[PDB]
Design an enzyme around this catalytic site. Structure first.
Site, short mmCIF file in Angstrom:
data_model
loop_
_atom_site.label_atom_id
_atom_site.label_comp_id
_atom_site.label_asym_id
_atom_site.label_seq_id
_atom_site.Cartn_x
_atom_site.Cartn_y
_atom_site.Cartn_z
N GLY A 13 1.89 -5.51 -4.79
CA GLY A 13 1.20 -5.62 -3.52
C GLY A 13 -0.29 -5.37 -3.64
N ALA A 73 4.74 -10.84 2.57
CA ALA A 73 5.87 -10.29 3.30
C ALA A 73 5.51 -9.90 4.73
CB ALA A 73 6.44 -9.07 2.56
N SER A 115 1.94 0.45 -2.27
CA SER A 115 1.79 1.12 -0.99
C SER A 115 3.16 1.34 -0.35
CB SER A 115 0.90 0.31 -0.05
OG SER A 115 1.46 -0.97 0.22
N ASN A 117 -10.38 3.51 -3.92
CA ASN A 117 -9.67 3.21 -5.16
C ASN A 117 -10.36 3.82 -6.38
OD1 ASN A 117 -7.79 1.81 -3.65
ND2 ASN A 117 -8.64 -0.21 -4.11
N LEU A 154 6.72 10.36 -20.59
CA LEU A 154 7.11 10.35 -19.19
C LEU A 154 8.23 11.34 -18.89
CD1 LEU A 154 7.10 6.49 -18.54
CD2 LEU A 154 5.28 8.15 -18.06
N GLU A 204 8.56 14.27 -19.91
CA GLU A 204 8.03 15.61 -19.72
C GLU A 204 7.53 15.84 -18.30
OE1 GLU A 204 5.90 16.77 -23.12
OE2 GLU A 204 5.23 18.72 -22.32
#
Ligand SMILES: Nc1nc2c(ncn2[C@@H]2O[C@H](COP(=O)(O)OP(=O)(O)OP(=O)(O)O)[C@@H](O)[C@H]2O)c(=O)[nH]1
Ligand SMILES: Nc1ncnc2c1ncn2[C@@H]1O[C@H](COP(=O)(O)OP(=O)(O)CP(=O)(O)O)[C@@H](O)[C@H]1O
Ligand SMILES: Nc1nc2c(ncn2[C@@H]2O[C@H](COP(=O)(O)OP(=O)(O)O)[C@@H](O)[C@H]2O)c(=O)[nH]1
Ligand SMILES: [Ca+2]
Ligand SMILES: [Ca+2]
Ligand SMILES: [Ca+2]
Ligand SMILES: [Mg+2]
Ligand SMILES: [Mg+2]
Ligand SMILES: [Mg+2]
EC number: 3.6.5.-
Lengths: 352, 54, 438, 422
Positions: C10, C99, C140, C228, C252, C254
């Site tokens: 998105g 969408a 999001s 951002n 990851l 951890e």
């Protein structure tokens, strides 16, 4: 045009503040569930602090400090005083207390009996009082067996503290009393003590040889007007105000209310509120808080002031509603939302 | 105030400081949900075309 | 060396993803063309930065990233942007119509027809990995694609990569920077279906980022670019351990071990400091104690809430710049005696600390001032439940009237999915209360 | 490339539609011959939404002109920007519709509708990704009302998943051509309740009062009224014609219930010829939310806003815009439903309309719109109870039962609005 919502219909204090806010022509009341408000006169229990300060462009203010219950709860206050270094376990102005959970549920049962047996063996007065927040439910006795058995018959946390066997008795009458002080804390955490206090007096002679009849030991305004036979004899509604009380202290004790009592009250108020300031302050918070407190003190025959409890949702003396409520609008609400003296409060300066 | 598991390298270091001790749907199942929703859309559209044909 | 694949879904995920890879390249010395002069192993290597960048025989360092959006205008920015040369076309996936802020449309109607293509592209990146760790998914809550298609992709990733960790960076909706009204529906619908598929999720409330940009950066009306760039700094702080030598949060797995003792409660609160305006004449450099103490101020949290009224389950301190353990421990001692830090009784009261000596990198011409030391604290507080309560309440107000529900049913979703998703959120709020309140 | 197909039907629909293309062609820099001569890239960024690109860098509106008599479309073809329209996109008959909904919908209109769909299909087939359709028409006549709603029904049959939008002019006895307008409007409204996603309600009485009371036009004309509609149509489509949109996204965030998709538009400023004075943001916001600036002739203080969309155009303080908007909401929150959080949205566009430093367009989905359908319903029943003027319609094959059902349908719509107002 400022907007506010009312979420506690039973509060006599903020029913008046709401009445005054509308009288200014610059405050508009909304439905209690409308999120677009500036001021929330919130509910007592389960106030949704998490939904405050998330409306774009709205500065939102609420009449309760989130976390102030630590001070306004029987058991909570005891734990806070004993565990907080600012107050310490040797706090000289709070009666020796102990948190006692009913046996049907940490707990201080053994610690209490240790100090109890000490007093019993030392010939010292060993009268304690058992109470809780779930009361209208109070017991006064000199036997630890009765105090502990009374709590087990209930189902909520109780506190046992030393009963002031040497209170200061007004004359004529030979009667007990307590002092109510209203303290307002604003969004900047200024501590304002209302200049006007009230003594809720007992209209019955104090009797130390009979704690069964609790009419002369409990100075509650409801107990005196329901179980006392001399209600309103000495003062209207068993309520003596500072002007009369100060004149009495001069006539009988050759001292003043400020010197003998008020200095200790101001000290105790500061100590309690400064202790929890880091935990409840809204200085850097996305919303702002203020709250009105009702401190209850006991004075002994040595003119030493003791703190009994702190009320987070207090009522006011019928004669003092207008003055105090207007003062709430002045320093608590208008200070954040100004409108288009000789203050009635006493600012208790402190280090933030 | 204890420090454990100190590890050092040229780009930094890490450690742990203790202040106090303590006291799925299968592939087939996802296809059905997707096709089920797709079927509901087809039914709704079929009723719209039926309405328009009337 | 174990690889990480980033997935951006998105508009929010894609634009945040673009900002992060810009920052990653500046942090690793990678030029817009993909060349990396400091990399002496041409066409290969298993360095730490290789967890995020593959290499071609010509020396191009290519992000391990997929960008997915159901409309092309946002991803077209990447195709013609400064770092266009970093990616090849297979990595950028765009549809023709979005969408429409409709969870049911991203998940069911459109998701059913594009999911297999997205998995194919991710499979191609996976085939380049000798030991894939898992995925970082940016999206999001409020968008139809970010909510609806993300939840579908997460379901399929658990099927196709059962033994791989999945972390999220999720943008929590804020009315100050949103023209949508149905975002509470999408946030709750996507959290329900994604909850059991995500091992650890870092929520960022646009409200908090927005106010920081106004308060600290003196931006009267922050844009998505301002938001951002700040968000990418926090993301960089969190993923630095995966991209540099070190011993804390090196894979990851951890993140869950250190931050999530209870699986459903996997939403750590992020706090970052300092954020200093570059336009300032010249700021006084804050000390370790000062930036550490700042981590317990609500004003620099990624989600506005009051940790003083929750319980901690874990607390990680990630420092970048001129920091030594001596100063960190001294600062922690000072803060414990002053702050309201209550851990749960079934968790030790401690802090895991990581220090990276490279100070934060600032994008030239950005809004952030270059500082000598910064910190990001990741703490799992029950106080973040305030964020769920707010969101669930907006949901309840609209759903009591079935407002906008017809748009979702019209795309093939059953009305019962609303209530099912809502009851799951009520259970999540109950879990937070059982862990935090006495 | 989110293309929109524009359709304009009948006298009112073609005269308002002509002015609309005149206004936006100027905003996008398209001259009367289709050539671009602007000085900004924002003008061409989204030009393909309404314009096709032909050989020689020519831009041709994606517009289809429809009528059952030649007169009005002969005027358009000879008007200012008449030469900009595709010659093949003029589809017209000769008989006329006689202000008769039945003629537009069932007889005269039925004979012409297929050739119109052939042109629609041709324009859609060349769209990269069709957003949807927008129709301009009146409800009080025969062609725009009867044939317009017939076209909508057949477009929905062929493009069931595309968005259908209309700008619908509602009749008023104060600005009336014939006494049968309430008949034609009641029959059209039901078609719109079923087959449109969004309908901008334009009341000719509101347009008249604005011209007379606010603009100080002593004797307003249809041309004066159409100036307000053009300006309003340009304001509501700014979201689609410049960067910052999408018809489906707008509908998703504006329509909480499928049948309640009738909007009240508003514009500001509305200045009389003190016309050069700079208009501040407070004045723009105050006026835009002022009933006198709205064109549905419905007092918003009689109902409640379900959703509100405001679009500000021109170089201005977006911070000050938020402060005034958040001021109007937080100062009259009694007129906004409290069960749709954050239901007032704001958008800013840098390019202002021609001859204005800044402007604001208002788009409200208000339950007060029920007053508009109430008035139409009352006028319908005043005549229908006596079966007055029905022979014009029964002569075209219609039965009285279809009038009774149209009456019931609109009173249902009114009752549906009433339940959400409380
Ligand atoms: N921080 C940040 N938030 C964004 C950005 N873009 C969109 N958002 C937020 O995301 C929400 C809207 O969802 P989007 O991501 O734009 O929608 P989407 O995922 O593209 O799905 P669609 O409905 O198909 O467009 C709103 O709450 C926005 O405030 C961004 O670049 N940065
Ligand atoms: N330790 C103690 N020694 C002597 N008297 C005591 C006491 N604790 C309580 N009292 C008496 O009890 C009365 C009120 O008790 P307590 O305040 O605990 O109950 P409560 O909270 O329901 C009344 P309120 O909230 O209005 O102050 C006081 O008037 C005081 O005289
Ligand atoms: N605003 C406006 N309304 C018009 C115009 N022409 C006609 N009307 C209104 O439209 C209705 C008559 O419909 P009309 O368009 O002339 O019939 P049609 O040609 O059969 O579609 C009446 O309510 C008129 O008041 C116009 O140019 N502008
Ligand atoms: Ca290499
Ligand atoms: Ca899993
Ligand atoms: Ca014929
Ligand atoms: Mg009490
Ligand atoms: Mg999008
Ligand atoms: Mg006519």
């Amino acid at each position: 045009m400022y907007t506010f919502v009312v979420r506690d219909e039973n509060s006599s204090v903020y029913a008046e503040v709401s009445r005054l806010l509308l009288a200014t022509g610059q405050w508009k009341r909304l439905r209690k569930d409308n999120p677009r408000f500036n001021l929330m006169l919130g509910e007592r229990n389960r106030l949704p602090f998490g939904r405050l300060g998330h409306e774009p462009g709205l500065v939102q203010l609420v009449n309760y400090y989130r976390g102030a219950d630590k001070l306004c709860r029987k058991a909570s206050l005891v734990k806070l005083i004993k565990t907080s270094p600012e107050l310490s376990e040797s706090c000289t102005w709070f009666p020796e207390s102990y948190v006692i959970y009913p046996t049907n549920l940490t707990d201080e049962r053994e610690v209490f009996l240790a100090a109890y047996n000490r007093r019993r063996e030392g010939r010292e007065g060993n009268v304690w009082i058992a109470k809780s927040s779930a009361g209208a439910g109070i017991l006064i006795s000199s036997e630890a067996s009765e105090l502990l058995d009374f709590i087990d018959e209930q189902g909520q946390v109780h506190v046992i503290q030393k009963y002031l066997e040497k209170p200061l008795l007004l004359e004529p009458g030979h009667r007990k009393f307590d002092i109510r002080s209203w303290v307002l804390v604003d969004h900047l955490y200024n501590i304002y003590l209302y200049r006007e206090g009230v003594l809720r007096t007992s209209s019955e002679p104090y009797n130390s040889a009979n704690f069964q009849d609790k009419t002369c030991h409990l100075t509650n305004h409801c107990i005196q007007k329901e179980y006392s036979k001399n209600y309103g004899r000495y003062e209207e509604g068993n309520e003596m105000f500072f002007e009369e009380f100060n004149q009495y202290l001069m006539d009988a004790l050759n001292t003043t209310l400020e010197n003998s009592i008020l200095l200790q009250i101001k000290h105790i108020i500061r100590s309690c509120l400064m202790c929890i300031e880091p935990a409840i302050s809204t200085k850097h918070l996305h919303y702002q808080s203020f709250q009105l407190f009702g401190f209850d003190f006991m004075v002994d025959e040595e003119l030493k002031v003791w703190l009994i409890e702190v009320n987070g949702a207090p009522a006011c003396a019928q004669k003092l509603y207008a003055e105090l409520c207007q003062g709430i609008v002045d320093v608590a609400i208008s200070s954040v939302f100004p409108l288009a003296p000789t203050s009635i409060f006493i600012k208790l300066h402190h280090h933030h | 105030m204890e420090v454990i598991e100190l590890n050092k390298c040229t780009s930094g270091q890490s450690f742990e400081v203790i202040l106090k001790p303590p006291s799925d749907p299968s592939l087939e199942e996802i296809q059905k949900k997707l096709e089920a929703a797709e079927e509901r859309r087809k039914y709704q559209e079929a009723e719209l075309l039926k309405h328009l044909a009337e | 060396m174990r690889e990480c694949i980033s997935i951006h879904v998105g508009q929010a995920g894609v634009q945040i993803g673009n900002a992060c890879w810009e920052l990653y390249c500046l942090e690793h010395g990678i030029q817009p063309d993909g060349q990396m002069p400091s990399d002496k192993t041409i066409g290969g290597g298993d360095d730490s930065f290789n967890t995020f960048f593959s290499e071609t025989g010509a020396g191009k360092h290519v992000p391990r990233a997929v960008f997915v959006d159901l409309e092309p205008t946002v991803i077209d920015e990447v195709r013609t942007g400064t770092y266009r040369q970093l990616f090849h076309p297979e990595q950028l996936i765009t549809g023709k119509e979005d969408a429409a802020n409709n969870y049911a449309r991203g998940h069911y109607t459109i998701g059913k027809e594009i999911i297999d293509l997205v998995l194919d592209r991710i499979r191609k990146l996976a085939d380049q990995c000798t030991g894939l760790q898992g995925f970082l998914v940016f999206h999001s809550f409020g968008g139809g694609t970010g909510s609806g298609f993300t939840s579908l992709l997460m379901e399929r990733l658990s099927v196709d990569y059962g033994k791989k960790s999945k972390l999220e960076f999720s943008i929590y909706p804020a009315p100050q920077v949103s023209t949508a009204v149905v975002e509470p529906y999408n946030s709750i619908l996507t959290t329900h279906t994604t909850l059991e598929h995500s091992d650890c999720a870092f929520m960022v409330d646009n409200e908090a980022i927005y106010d920081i940009c106004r308060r600290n950066l003196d931006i009267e009306r922050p844009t998505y670019t301002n938001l951002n760039r700040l968000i990418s700094q926090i993301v960089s702080s969190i993923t630095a351990s995966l991209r540099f030598d070190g011993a804390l949060n090196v894979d990851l797995t951890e993140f869950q071990t250190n931050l999530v003792p209870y699986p459903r409660i996997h939403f750590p609160l992020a706090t970052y400091a300092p954020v200093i305006s570059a336009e300032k004449a010249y700021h006084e450099q804050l000390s370790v104690a000062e930036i550490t103490n700042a981590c317990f101020e609500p004003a620099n949290q990624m989600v506005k809430c009051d940790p003083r009224h929750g319980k901690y389950m874990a607390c990680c301190l990630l420092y970048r710049g001129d920091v030594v353990p001596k100063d960190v421990n001294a600062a922690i001692a000072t803060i414990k005696t002053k702050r309201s830090i209550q851990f749960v009784d079934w968790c030790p009261t401690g802090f895991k600390v990581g220090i990276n000596y490279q100070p934060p990198t600032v994008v030239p011409g950005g809004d952030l001032a270059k500082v000598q030391r910064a910190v990001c604290m990741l703490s799992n507080t029950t106080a973040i439940a305030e964020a769920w309560a707010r969101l669930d309440h907006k949901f309840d107000l609209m759903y009591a009237k079935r407002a906008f529900v017809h748009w979702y049913v019209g795309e093939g979703m059953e009305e019962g999915e609303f209530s099912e998703a809502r009851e799951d959120m009520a259970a999540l709020e109950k879990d937070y209360e059982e862990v935090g309140v006495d | 490339m989110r293309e929109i197909v524009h359709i304009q039907a009948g006298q009112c629909g073609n005269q308002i539609g002509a002015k609309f293309w005149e206004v936006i062609s100027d905003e996008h820099g398209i001259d009367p011959t289709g050539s671009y001569h602007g000085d900004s890239d924002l003008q061409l960024e989204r030009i393909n939404v309404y314009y096709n690109e032909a050989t020689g860098n020519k831009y041709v509106p994606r517009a289809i002109l429809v009528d059952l008599e030649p007169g009005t479309m002969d005027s358009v073809r000879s008007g200012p920007f008449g030469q900009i329209f595709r010659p093949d996109n003029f589809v017209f008959g000769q008989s006329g519709a006689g202000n008769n909904w039945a003629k537009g919908h069932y007889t005269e209109g039925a004979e012409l509708v297929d050739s119109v769909l052939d042109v629609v299909r041709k324009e859609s087939e060349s769209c990269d990704c069709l957003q949807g359709f927008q129709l301009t028409h009146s409800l009080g006549g025969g062609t725009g009302s009867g044939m317009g709603t017939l076209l909508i029904s057949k477009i929905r049959e062929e493009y069931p998943d595309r968005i259908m939008n209309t700008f619908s002019v509602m009749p008023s006895p104060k600005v009336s051509d014939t006494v049968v307008e309430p008949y034609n409007a009641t029959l059209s409204v039901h078609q719109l309740v079923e087959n449109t996603d969004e309908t901008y309600c334009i009341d000719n009485e509101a347009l008249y009062d604005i011209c007379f009371r606010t603009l100080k036009l002593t004797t307003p004309t249809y041309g004066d009224l159409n100036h307000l509609v053009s300006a309003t149509m340009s304001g509501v489509t700014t979201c689609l014609r410049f960067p910052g949109a999408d018809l489906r996204k707008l509908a998703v965030n504006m329509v909480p219930f499928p049948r309640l998709h009738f909007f009240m538009p508003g514009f500001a400023p509305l200045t009389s010829r003190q016309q050069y004075r700079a208009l501040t943001v407070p004045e723009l916001t105050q006026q835009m939310f002022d009933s006198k600036n709205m064109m549905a002739a419905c007092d918003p203080r009689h109902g409640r806003y379900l959703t509100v969309a405001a679009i500000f155009r021109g170089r201005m303080s977006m911070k000050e815009v938020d402060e005034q908007m958040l001021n109007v909401q937080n100062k009259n929150s009694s007129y906004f439903v409290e069960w749709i959080p954050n239901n007032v949205k704001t958008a800013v566009c840098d390019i202002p309309p021609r001859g204005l430093k800044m402007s604001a367009t208002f788009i409200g989905n208000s339950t007060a719109i029920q007053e508009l359908f109430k008035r139409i319903s009352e006028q319908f029943t005043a005549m229908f109870r006596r079966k007055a003027f029905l022979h014009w319609y029964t002569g075209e094959g219609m039965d009285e039962m279809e009038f009774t059902e149209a009456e019931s349908n609109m009173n249902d719509l009114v009752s549906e609005y009433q339940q959400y107002q409380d």
